[PDB]
Structure 1
């Protein structure tokens, strides 16, 4: 059961940068084994390269509350009612950094929050047909009574919102929260909150 082939079964022949900016778009050239027993010819694919991210679900297990951050994401404009989105604390992971270090720094910068205990949620590929981006989600213990106000640096303007867990999940169901990181984190929380609250309120 499970997948069929490993890295022994694919060769990346070359990568060619197509666009070099803040992010990049690369052409990967590769060959790989086929399910029918053969080898592919040389395949090329365009891949959006933007590094990888740490994501923090700020959860108050005493109050059963979730902290959301609101900020504009202009890429949402063409398909969304508003480009202002309700999201998880998050940031890019630079060389040598840990997911936790980034999550804690961003919790302070984006939401004014200290974080207590932390546990992994899941690490996922955002859209692996066209981007390499991986985002690694943690849940972080917070005191939601300390979450409030306007944060961010400059080019960054972020409003904190505090909701109950059930309210946040209702917002997912209704489409008011509709970005992958937040949907994944809040679905996970709906599946795990009973044990998590028990663990963190012993």
Structure 2
């Protein structure tokens, strides 16, 4: 059971920089084993290289509340009613940093929030047919009464509004499509599947 082939079964021959800017687009050139027993020819794939992220679900287990951050994501424009999205605290992981350190820093910068205990949720590939991006989600214990106002680093063009909702309200917003970005959907579905045990663990 499970997958069939490993890194022993693929060779990346080269990678070519197609675009170098704030992010990169690379052409991976590779060969790989086929399920029918043979080897492929040379395959090329364009891969968006934009580093990797830490994501924090800020959950108040006493009040059963979730903290959301609202900010514009221009890429949402063409397929969404508004480019302002309700999301999780999140940011890029730089060389040598831990997921948890990034999550704590972004929680302060983006929501004014201190974080207590944490637990991993899931680490996922956003869209692995075309981007290498992995996002590692934690749940962090917060006092949602301290979450309010306008945050973000303005000198970085980051303008963020904090919203506090109940867990059930946040999940309803997922069901209705009002929250519809992968990181938040995954985190809030996870919360719906684990909140009983998590609240118990964090209110003992």
Q: TM-score, normalised to structure 2's length?
A: 0.99
- Please report how far the alpha carbon of residue 50 of structure 1 lies from its aligned counterpart in structure 2 after TM superposition: 0.1
Over residues 1-21 of structure 1, what are the superposed CA-to-partner deviations in whole Å (9 max), with x where a residue is unaligned? 000000000000000000100
Q: What is the alpha-carbon distance in structure 1 between the residues aligned to residue 35 and residue 191 of structure 2?
A: 37
Q: What is the alpha-carbon distance in structure 2 between the residues aligned to residue 89 and residue 80 of structure 1?
A: 20
SS in 2 for 1:27: strand
Over residues 8-54 of structure 1, what are the superposed CA-to-partner deviations in whole Å (9 max), with x where a residue is unaligned? 00000000000100000000000000000000000000000000000
- Please report how far the alpha carbon of residue 66 of structure 1 lies from its aligned counterpart in structure 2 after TM superposition: 0.1
- Please report how far the alpha carbon of residue 59 of structure 1 lies from its aligned counterpart in structure 2 after TM superposition: 0.0
**4+ runs of 1 displaced by more than 4 Å?**
none
SS in 1 for 2:66: strand
RMSD: 0.4
SS in 1 for 2:91: strand
Over residues 97-118 of structure 1, what are the superposed CA-to-partner deviations in whole Å (9 max), with x where a residue is unaligned? 0000000000000000000000
SS in 1 for 2:190: helix
Q: What is the alpha-carbon distance in structure 1 between the residues aligned to residue 68 and residue 196 of structure 2?
A: 20
Q: What is the alpha-carbon distance in structure 2 between the residues aligned to residue 29 and residue 77 of structure 1?
A: 32
- Please report how far the alpha carbon of residue 165 of structure 1 lies from its aligned counterpart in structure 2 after TM superposition: 0.1
- Please report how far the alpha carbon of residue 182 of structure 1 lies from its aligned counterpart in structure 2 after TM superposition: 0.0
Q: TM-score, normalised to structure 1's length?
A: 1.00
- Please report how far the alpha carbon of residue 183 of structure 1 lies from its aligned counterpart in structure 2 after TM superposition: 0.1
- Please report how far the alpha carbon of residue 174 of structure 1 lies from its aligned counterpart in structure 2 after TM superposition: 0.2
